[PDB]
Write a protein that binds this ligand. Structure first.
Ligand SMILES: Cc1cc2nc3c(=O)[nH]c(=O)nc-3n(C[C@H](O)[C@H](O)[C@H](O)COP(=O)(O)O)c2cc1C
Ligand SMILES: Cc1cc2nc3c(=O)[nH]c(=O)nc-3n(C[C@H](O)[C@H](O)[C@H](O)COP(=O)(O)O)c2cc1C
Ligand SMILES: Nc1c(C(=O)O)[nH]c(=O)[nH]c1=O
Ligand SMILES: Nc1c(C(=O)O)[nH]c(=O)[nH]c1=O
Lengths: 306, 306
């Protein structure tokens, strides 16, 4: 009978594991408010750079039968804006808040983190540092985490690009394991630089980068699951946030089974809007009721191998 | 008007660009014969090691709604077998033959190539060197190609794992461009180490490697197109063979638009059997008819960017 999607991590309680994926429906005040008013357990603001960015020329996003492709190019209101939202506007009474940071250089991250620190202390906003590029360069990654850890006296998480072999899972996990402050790992950012071609128009579907763009949605689910689980296994001291290919409570069930604590929703949210969180909570509860699970902790990470 | 799927490359004529992906339906004599008797323009033998390999424990392949996952583990009849097939049995009158080679070390590839050379000379079998792991380690990749190029007195092709960013496309192309004997690049091998989880059983679906395995099929098409196109652009001296996500003539059309000369079919072929090539040729012809193309040359690599 009695079930709960409650998640507890980083001294916070989340009503449920769902949140937007960074960059989806979280750029403007209006979006952040809608995410906060939504049934989501949490939200994360658009990955920010120190100054506003208009991002790439349009079209830079295309929804697809099997997901999405994008090359948004970090359009965002700038760090000050997301800092102010976290410091002054966000209703922490409603749900915890993650702030995604994507400085274009290590120095930019360091300088933003210096300023984020006080707000994290005061309001409890949690950094998701977008490493996804940095995450495909392990030396740079360690360097970056060192620099940020030096100036940011709080736990935070990293948003990772997907990896595709155990050597990379091992190497990434080894670096992340060097940093106790990295308390969560978000797997995954989009599968990088896919190329969608529309057979009718015989063209690509997005303008930037000759049509090459990050894949999200149903394309990425097994890759997301792999990475969630790969890091779940290799970083037992950390939590994993799942991101990639979640359209239904069943998809979310798979993320959690693979090891996810929070489950982020990108493409599906972009296509459906924040009402999706009511559906997803209801669907995950339904999947759990059918499977006789009462809590997420009961099956998180418990995917059975053969 | 008159249409033709004919492809001319590597001093050969192909009735059409279709062939099996290495490792699919090309391990046994019967499979090779069936591929030869099929409507495909060519075939490639299962990636071989010097000796017979039993491969990984089963289940090691699973068909999925969006494609497939596998960790076959190079089950193959051994090099002598594929070499003998190429030397003694294959009917080159029907179609050219590619031999896929995947030695477990540089040494093995060298020794097999040394022996393959004569059969390539006499019979015209074309090596597809499986680099896909080696191709994710650019030094190992350089070393592998240097070694093979040193001992193997023929043009050959390389089967590439997918890359996911331009830095990698550039790095790989730079390396490939340093080897004039590499005259085709097959993009792509499976998307590595996805993890399929069956929500019903709460388990992975293949046994080896904790359920992690290469993704093929619908999952991989934009990644395949990206890679085909990325290397099509960066290796203008070379042919690109497309592989990944081809189930229909329209998919094939996308491959060719992206730059593919040959189009390899794995997952779809696994599920449908070699009769698929009759459907694929018909479908591709139909797509070309509706679009008023008469030859593949007319649109190969002509994907329009915005
Ligand atoms: C339009 C769009 C914008 C995105 N912006 C960001 C971003 O700013 N920062 C980030 O880390 N990921 C960003 N992502 C990637 C998502 O956070 C997520 O990692 C990816 O889309 C996979 O999730 P999905 O399959 O639910 O779409 C974006 C994705 C999309 C489609
Ligand atoms: C069962 C199976 C066996 C495969 N064996 C090989 C192989 O031996 N050598 C190789 O280069 N690729 C192998 N592959 C990868 C395919 O050749 C192809 O690169 C990949 O499956 C993507 O094509 P697809 O989407 O049509 O399946 C195999 C794939 C599958 C599913
Ligand atoms: N910053 C990101 C973007 C973007 O284009 O802004 N798109 C993504 O898919 N992932 C990111 O991390
Ligand atoms: N050798 C390969 C296999 C295999 O399992 O043998 N599976 C793949 O997906 N790709 C390969 O190159």
């Amino acid at each position: 009978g009695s079930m709960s999607l409650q998640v507890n991590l980083l001294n916070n309680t989340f009503a449920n594991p769902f949140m937007n994926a960074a960059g989806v429906m979280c750029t403007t005040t209006e979006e952040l408010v809608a995410m906060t008013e939504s049934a989501s357990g949490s939200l994360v603001s658009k990955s920010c750079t120190p100054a506003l960015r208009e991002g790439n020329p349009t079209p830079r996003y295309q929804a697809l039968p099997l997901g999405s492709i994008n090359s948004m190019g970090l359009p965002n209101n700038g760090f000050d804006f997301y800092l102010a939202y976290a410091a002054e506007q966000h209703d922490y009474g409603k749900k915890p808040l993650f702030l995604s940071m994507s400085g274009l250089s290590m120095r930019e991250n360091v300088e933003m983190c210096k300023r984020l620190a006080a707000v994290a202390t005061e309001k409890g906003v949690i950094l998701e540092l977008n490493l996804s590029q940095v995450a495909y360069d392990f030396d740079a990654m360690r360097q970056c985490l060192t620099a940020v850890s030096e100036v940011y006296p709080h736990s935070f998480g990293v948003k990772m690009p997907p990896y595709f072999d155990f050597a990379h899972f091992d190497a990434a996990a080894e670096i992340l394991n060097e940093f106790p402050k990295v308390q969560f790992i978000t797997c995954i950012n989009s599968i990088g630089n896919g190329l969608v071609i529309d057979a009718e128009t015989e063209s690509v579907v997005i303008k930037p980068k000759q049509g090459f763009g990050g894949l999200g949605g149903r394309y990425v689910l097994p890759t997301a699951l792999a990475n969630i689980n790969a890091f779940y296994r290799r970083c037992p001291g950390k939590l994993i946030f799942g991101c990639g290919g979640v359209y239904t409570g069943e998809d979310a069930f798979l993320h959690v089974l693979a090891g996810a604590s929070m489950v982020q929703v990108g493409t599906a949210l972009q296509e459906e809007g924040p009402s999706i969180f009511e559906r997803l909570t209801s669907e995950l509860l339904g999947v759990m009721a059918k499977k006789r699970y009462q809590t997420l902790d009961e099956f998180r990470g418990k995917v059975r191998t053969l």
